[PDB]
Design an enzyme around this catalytic site. Structure first.
Site, PDB file in Angstrom:
ATOM      1  N   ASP A 285      44.688  32.015  -6.992  1.00  0.00           N
ATOM      2  CA  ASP A 285      43.429  31.423  -6.566  1.00  0.00           C
ATOM      3  C   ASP A 285      42.300  32.440  -6.667  1.00  0.00           C
ATOM      4  O   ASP A 285      42.444  33.576  -6.227  1.00  0.00           O
ATOM      5  CB  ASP A 285      43.570  30.916  -5.126  1.00  0.00           C
TER       6      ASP A 285
ATOM      7  N   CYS B  53      34.624  29.372 -10.411  1.00  0.00           N
ATOM      8  CA  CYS B  53      36.081  29.366 -10.286  1.00  0.00           C
ATOM      9  C   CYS B  53      36.854  28.869 -11.512  1.00  0.00           C
ATOM     10  O   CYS B  53      37.923  29.394 -11.811  1.00  0.00           O
ATOM     11  CB  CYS B  53      36.525  28.615  -9.020  1.00  0.00           C
TER      12      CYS B  53
ATOM     13  N   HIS C  79      39.228  31.998  -5.297  1.00  0.00           N
ATOM     14  CA  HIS C  79      38.235  31.784  -4.265  1.00  0.00           C
ATOM     15  C   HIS C  79      38.082  32.852  -3.181  1.00  0.00           C
ATOM     16  O   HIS C  79      38.285  32.598  -1.999  1.00  0.00           O
ATOM     17  CB  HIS C  79      38.440  30.400  -3.650  1.00  0.00           C
TER      18      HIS C  79
END
Length: 333
Positions: free
Chosen positions: A247, A70, A249
């Site tokens: 993001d 990430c 994720h």
């Protein structure tokens, strides 16, 4: 291996219809009369998430970065935004049903998950080893920044100059030494300036909040990358007391001439928002100065902000990140 796809089950909320200005990478918007433009600007940013089924890293390494890459993905996003500004311009916007410039696909291609792409997860991970980080290991902002600098050396198409300012100081003479290609009568290598910082022990000192907001209000703002391990985010702006971010994720299948199916590289869900007071202390703030005039303008803005501080600007002269401990922090530490 799918307990790291936290974006999949996160709470999504639409933008609050308030009077607070919405800032996205140096651009100011009004949620009342510019909601479409805001959403377009956020969706236009190149978004990079976990990927799966890409060629094994190093032939025997991972075929997916789910659960460990990430920060590498946020590193890719902030660097892609710089390439977008360098090749396409800050005013460029991505729209479905429209033919994007060839340079757009070249930029995107540089982040595809294959070893021959300059900034692919393969190259980032492999370059990280030289930084003392084994493949599969999560990086901090400083490390990913150092890796991007070394990777950019091979990208002669962009011919960028990447400067990582340590010791909370930006030395202008060093920037000129790095960017000047020749004596001014391109004479200047487009500059990607990254500044790693640590704004507190467990949280960021509130005194930094105002300075941080101003970092998203400059024409040269590339945003901020940061977050706790396996919780990295690419912050692109703010509204009120919240930071707006992208993001990574979520794990998406790797994408196989010029054309490239690019829908998966654009965040179309409601933009993620987070309370500024909930931001992890370790971050890296970036700025992009395409020409020396841009850099000069940037310096002028840093002068005000400082006068009316996360880092200092000086003309001339161990790499340290300085943590400003308040009376309380000194106690809790």
């Amino acid at each position: 291996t799918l307990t790291y796809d936290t974006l999949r089950f996160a709470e999504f909320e639409d933008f609050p219809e308030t009077s607070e200005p919405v800032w996205i990478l140096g651009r100011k918007y009004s949620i009342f009369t510019e909601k479409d433009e805001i959403l377009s600007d956020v969706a236009s940013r190149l978004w990079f998430t976990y990927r799966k089924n890409f060629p094994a890293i190093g032939g025997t390494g991972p075929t997916s970065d789910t659960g460990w890459g990430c920060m590498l993905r946020c590193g890719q996003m902030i660097f892609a935004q710089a390439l977008v500004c360098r090749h396409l311009g800050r005013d460029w916007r991505w729209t479905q049903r429209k033919r994007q410039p060839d340079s757009y696909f070249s930029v995107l291609n540089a982040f595809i998950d294959r070893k021959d792409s300059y900034y692919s997860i393969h190259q980032i991970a492999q370059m990280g080893v030289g930084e003392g980080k084994s493949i599969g290991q999560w990086y901090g902002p400083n490390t990913v920044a150092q890796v991007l600098k070394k990777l950019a050396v091979f990208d002669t198409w962009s011919s960028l100059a990447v400067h990582i300012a340590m010791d909370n100081t930006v030395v202008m003479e060093e920037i000129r030494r790095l960017c000047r290609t020749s004596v001014p009568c391109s004479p200047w290598r487009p500059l990607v300036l990254l500044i790693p910082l640590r704004l507190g022990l467990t949280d960021i000192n509130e005194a930094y909040v105002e300075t941080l907001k101003h970092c998203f209000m400059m024409p040269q703002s590339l945003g901020v990358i940061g977050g706790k391990p396996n919780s990295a985010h690419y912050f692109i702006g703010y509204v009120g007391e919240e930071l707006i971010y992208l993001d990574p994720h979520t794990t998406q299948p790797a994408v196989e001439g010029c054309f490239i199916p690019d829908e998966s590289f654009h965040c179309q869900h409601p933009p993620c928002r987070m309370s500024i007071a909930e931001l992890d202390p370790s971050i890296a703030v970036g700025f992009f100065c395409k020409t020396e005039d841009d850099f000069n303008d940037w310096c002028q803005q840093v002068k005000k902000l400082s006068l009316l501080p996360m880092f200092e600007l000086v003309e001339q002269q161990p790499d340290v990140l300085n943590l400003s401990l308040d009376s309380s922090d000194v106690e809790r530490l």
